[PDB]
Amino acid sequence: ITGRPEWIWLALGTALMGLGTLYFLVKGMGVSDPDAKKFYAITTLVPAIAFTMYLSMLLGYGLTMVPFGGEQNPIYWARYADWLFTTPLLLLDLALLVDADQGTILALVGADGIMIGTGLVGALTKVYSYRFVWWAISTAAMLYILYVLFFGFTSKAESMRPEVASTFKVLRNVTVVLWSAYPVVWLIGSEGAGIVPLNIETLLFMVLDVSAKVGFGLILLRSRAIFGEAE
Amino acid sequence: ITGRPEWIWLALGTALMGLGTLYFLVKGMGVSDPDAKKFYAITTLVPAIAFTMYLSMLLGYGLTMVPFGGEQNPIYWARYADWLFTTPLLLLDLALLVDADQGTILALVGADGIMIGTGLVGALTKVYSYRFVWWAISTAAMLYILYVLFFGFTSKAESMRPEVASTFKVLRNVTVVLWSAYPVVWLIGSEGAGIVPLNIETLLFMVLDVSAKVGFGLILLRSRAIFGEAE
Amino acid sequence: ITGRPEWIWLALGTALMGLGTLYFLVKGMGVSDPDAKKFYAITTLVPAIAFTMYLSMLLGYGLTMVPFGGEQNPIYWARYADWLFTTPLLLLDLALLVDADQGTILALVGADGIMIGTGLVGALTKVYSYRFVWWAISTAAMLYILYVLFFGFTSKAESMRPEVASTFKVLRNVTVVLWSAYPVVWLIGSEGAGIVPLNIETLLFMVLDVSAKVGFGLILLRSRAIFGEAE
Numbered sequence A, B, C: 001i002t003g004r005p006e007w008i009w010l011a012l013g014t015a016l017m018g019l020g021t022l023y024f025l026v027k028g029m030g031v032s033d034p035d036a037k038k039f040y041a042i043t044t045l046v047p048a049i050a051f052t053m054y055l056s057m058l059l060g061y062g063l064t065m066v067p068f069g070g071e072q073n074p075i076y077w078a079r080y081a082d083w084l085f086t087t088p089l090l091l092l093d094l095a096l097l098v099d100a101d102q103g104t105i106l107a108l109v110g111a112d113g114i115m116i117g118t119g120l121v122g123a124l125t126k127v128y129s130y131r132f133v134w135w136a137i138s139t140a141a142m143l144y145i146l147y148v149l150f151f152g153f154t155s156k157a158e159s160m161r162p163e164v165a166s167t168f169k170v171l172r173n174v175t176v177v178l179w180s181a182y183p184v185v186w187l188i189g190s191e192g193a194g195i196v197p198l199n200i201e202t203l204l205f206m207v208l209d210v211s212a213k214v215g216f217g218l219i220l221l222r223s224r225a226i227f228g229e230a231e
């Protein structure tokens, strides 16, 4: 484990995702509202999945070597197995908050799968220049997601209860800022141009992951928007 | 790229799926009917997924070598990753058109997963004679799907609006004819008996894919069956 | 095939899953109740999936070698591909029986995915002591599932029709007893401590699989709880 300088950030990430999972699990014990139960189930699964994948990276299972640039490059593939399941769950939290229609939910989840799937292909591609073709396709899929979150959901939240509109607006802004950083870290990190070393890259993804999952969840599950209007 | 004679058909397929995706995306911009939005989302995702997998084959990522018959045989595995997601989406288009019940939808999607999954196992199997055992199981799963589309959905469409009944009947006939060709191309192509060479096999799958996805989508999204009855 | 002593139990399992699939398929022909169709579709898919994965193990495709303990250990990875899809389908049978809320269904299916996913990682892990870390995480996920089936569903079934309450109680008890045996067989078998040899381990999993899928299905599909109350 300790033979890799980035191990400290993988261990911290593992701990923070595990602690986040347990807090949400305990906090959700005393909840019977069927609407609130939906948000607790979605939001608790997110850091639980991330916990297992951070642990796999810490123990060395989620790491492979990819030859490109005449070098064997360490690629943590477990990140994409994490994101494949956690990013659509996070979008479902937002879509259920605004009572989005089914067709829009399917478009979001499908574009998200394309985003993560093409990012994985780009991470494992051995022809250096082709890695950035996949990065560009994946980034186009992300821009579609961000467009929908702004010019489809925002207008839908305003016609909703005030507390669900204000909570959505906050979580929307958090998501757009944090998610946009991921393609940048990829491009300048060891998967892309190799400007930033792997140990610093790992620290950046850990800060982003914890903020986008645990921080996101703390804002959502403390809001009254997750409960139905009741007397 | 150009070192493979089949590259021209992979490049054409990539272009036609990309163009198809963009047309459906633009055409769906001016749509607010929640029913129509469902069909546009399903139908636009189909060629978008196929685009990415054709590109992976063009660039050489979606290709592996499988030893059988005393030879290293080029097997494009990316086809099955495509079909795993696009064939159930196409069946969902048909099932939603006739307002199929949930139990029937689950049976269709499950049989479809078995069809594609066993076809993938057959494509990667190293014992030559066993490849055709998997082909037979996969073909049995397809025949179940075709039976349901005829002796379960057809009777349901007649009790529906006339425009949804006539549109379903057309898309049903297109699907049964085109899908039935796939097991035949597999059997006589490089995955099976090896009668037809890979470059011709690739041309045939490209014609079938574009027809079953883009051609299918053009018929559906030009129909009024996708809109609810409104004044 | 016959070069492996466990082949006899893989062949028996294949036959019993295939026969089970055909019986459920025939029995479900004469069913039009939309509620009953749901249970028949879920319950017939379970042994059909298991059939294909037992066949892959029989023919040698679903087997790999994992080095640990200074030895190349035969690991049947196809079991986890089976369980990944069949265990959530079995939980869906139970959840639909008691009309569970959506949030609870998602929590069950998500915990089940974590259970199977971490068990697969543990089966393929090359550092011997780490294999049991994954076993423990997977077992914690199972205990969560069992808790929900007892202290969330049981109370919900009592407020239901008597026949659905008594049928659920029976299937609940069958599930908790049979599922609990799996982590024990893993721990003492070739994936874990290696006390029980592989051929005996394979026999035990076959008895458990057939009972948990075909036996489970025979109890459910003979009950009147799967039909709506009708005159």
Ligand SMILES: CC(C)CCC[C@@H](C)CCC[C@@H](C)CCC[C@@H](C)CCOC[C@@H](CO)OCC[C@H](C)CCC[C@H](C)CCC[C@H](C)CCCC(C)C
Pocket (backbone or CB within 6 Å): A084, A109, A110, A113, A114, A117, A118, A120, A121, A124, B045, B049, B052, B064, B077, B080, B081, B082, B084, B085, B120
């Ligand atoms: C509606 C939305 C959900 C739609 C989703 C969008 C999606 C279509 C976007 C594209 C996804 C696609 C790129 C997934 C590729 C997975 C692949 C990286 C797995 C590893 O295989 C890659 C190479 C080794 O580098 O295999 C070496 C050769 C091996 C012999 C490969 C044989 C196994 C194949 C991988 C079998 C295909 C399985 C499916 C891809 C499983 C789904 C994986 C997940 C990442 C989507």
Ligand SMILES: CC(C)CCC[C@@H](C)CCC[C@@H](C)CCC[C@@H](C)CCOC[C@@H](CO)OCC[C@H](C)CCC[C@H](C)CCC[C@H](C)CCCC(C)C
Pocket (backbone or CB within 6 Å): B084, B109, B110, B113, B114, B117, B118, B120, B121, B124, C045, C049, C052, C064, C077, C080, C081, C082, C084, C085, C120
């Ligand atoms: C309700 C419906 C959706 C049900 C679906 C029906 C489905 C059950 C039908 C059978 C599907 C099954 C054959 C999928 C097999 C995937 C497999 C080809 C992936 C590549 O692995 C094959 C060998 C190399 O040749 O791995 C070499 C050895 C490696 C060490 C393998 C270890 C990884 C395992 C593959 C882990 C299992 C992952 C799941 C199979 C992922 C789903 C893939 C998709 C193709 C279903």
Ligand SMILES: CC(C)CCC[C@@H](C)CCC[C@@H](C)CCC[C@@H](C)CCOC[C@@H](CO)OCC[C@H](C)CCC[C@H](C)CCC[C@H](C)CCCC(C)C
Pocket (backbone or CB within 6 Å): A045, A049, A052, A064, A077, A080, A081, A082, A084, A085, A120, C084, C109, C110, C113, C114, C117, C118, C120, C121, C124
């Ligand atoms: C809501 C719920 C459904 C959530 C589900 C819970 C889930 C997150 C729990 C953890 C699942 C995770 C451990 C799955 C790992 C699959 C992995 C074993 C496949 C084989 O790859 C392992 C190594 C060889 O040993 O690959 C060698 C290196 C290769 C180069 C690997 C590159 C391919 C990657 C495997 C791509 C990721 C694909 C996804 C993991 C596909 C889903 C598989 C299924 C088992 C979940």
Ligand SMILES: *C/C=C(C)/C=C/C=C(C)/C=C/C1=C(C)CCCC1(C)C
Pocket (backbone or CB within 6 Å): A083, A086, A087, A090, A115, A116, A119, A120, A135, A138, A139, A142, A179, A180, A182, A183, A186, A209, A212, A213
């Ligand atoms: C909890 C994890 C989250 C919210 C991860 C989000 C990840 C992304 C938005 C990743 C995006 C990428 C691109 C847009 C292209 C480059 C490759 C990716 C996958 C890093």
Ligand SMILES: *C/C=C(C)/C=C/C=C(C)/C=C/C1=C(C)CCCC1(C)C
Pocket (backbone or CB within 6 Å): B083, B086, B087, B090, B115, B116, B119, B120, B135, B138, B139, B142, B179, B180, B182, B183, B186, B209, B212, B213
């Ligand atoms: C857009 C792609 C489509 C509609 C693909 C359809 C593919 C099939 C219907 C494939 C069927 C197969 C068999 C029936 C057995 C032989 C292997 C397959 C997977 C080619």
Ligand SMILES: *C/C=C(C)/C=C/C=C(C)/C=C/C1=C(C)CCCC1(C)C
Pocket (backbone or CB within 6 Å): C083, C086, C087, C090, C115, C116, C119, C120, C135, C138, C139, C142, C179, C180, C182, C183, C186, C209, C212, C213
């Ligand atoms: C039809 C198959 C069924 C119902 C299989 C159930 C399997 C389990 C409940 C497996 C549980 C495991 C653990 C709890 C940890 C050890 C590894 C597993 C996956 C065997």
Ligand SMILES: CCCCCCCCCCCCCCC
Pocket (backbone or CB within 6 Å): A181, A184, A185, A195, A196, A197, A200
């Ligand atoms: C979206 C965030 C990207 C900003 C990356 C900042 C990295 C600064 C760290 C110093 C770079 C290390 C280079 C010298 C080793």
Ligand SMILES: CCCCCCCCCCCCCCC
Pocket (backbone or CB within 6 Å): A016, A019, A020, A023, A210, A211, A214, A215, A218
């Ligand atoms: C009462 C609110 C705080 C509860 C404690 C939460 C502990 C989980 C770890 C959170 C750290 C990361 C927060 C986002 C920066």
Ligand SMILES: CCCCCCCCCCCCCCC
Pocket (backbone or CB within 6 Å): B181, B184, B185, B195, B196, B197, B200
């Ligand atoms: C379902 C369509 C299958 C028909 C295949 C027709 C192939 C004819 C092309 C000529 C065969 C090439 C053999 C000589 C190289």
Ligand SMILES: CCCCCCCCCCCCCCC
Pocket (backbone or CB within 6 Å): B016, B019, B020, B023, B210, B211, B214, B215, B218
């Ligand atoms: C107005 C209808 C035609 C629009 C142009 C569609 C261009 C997408 C490519 C379609 C070619 C394949 C059609 C099926 C044979």
Ligand SMILES: CCCCCCCCCCCCCCC
Pocket (backbone or CB within 6 Å): C181, C184, C185, C195, C196, C197, C200
């Ligand atoms: C949950 C069931 C686990 C019980 C396992 C009993 C196995 C007894 C078979 C004899 C053990 C073989 C050891 C000598 C070869």
Ligand SMILES: CCCCCCCCCCCCCCC
Pocket (backbone or CB within 6 Å): C016, C019, C020, C023, C210, C211, C214, C215, C218
């Ligand atoms: C009339 C009920 C029996 C029908 C025959 C079922 C045959 C399928 C194989 C069942 C054997 C396994 C039963 C569970 C132990």
Ligand SMILES: CCCCCCCCCCCCCC
Pocket (backbone or CB within 6 Å): A084, A085, A088, A089, A092, A102, A105, A106, A109, A113
């Ligand atoms: C490729 C993996 C995608 C599945 C991720 C799991 C979450 C799915 C959310 C589905 C939302 C409901 C759509 C109607």
Ligand SMILES: CCCCCCCCCCCCCC
Pocket (backbone or CB within 6 Å): B084, B085, B088, B089, B092, B102, B105, B106, B109, B113
């Ligand atoms: C194995 C991958 C299957 C999932 C394909 C994605 C489409 C799923 C459609 C689900 C239809 C809704 C069923 C109720």
Ligand SMILES: CCCCCCCCCCCCC
Pocket (backbone or CB within 6 Å): A139, A143, A146, A147, A150, A180, A183, A184
């Ligand atoms: C185009 C939709 C408007 C909202 C999206 C904001 C774009 C942020 C740019 C992200 C940069 C990634 C490289």
Ligand SMILES: CCCCCCCCCCCCC
Pocket (backbone or CB within 6 Å): B139, B143, B146, B147, B150, B180, B183, B184
């Ligand atoms: C048996 C259901 C009737 C409709 C299915 C038509 C069968 C077409 C044969 C396809 C040939 C594939 C080898």
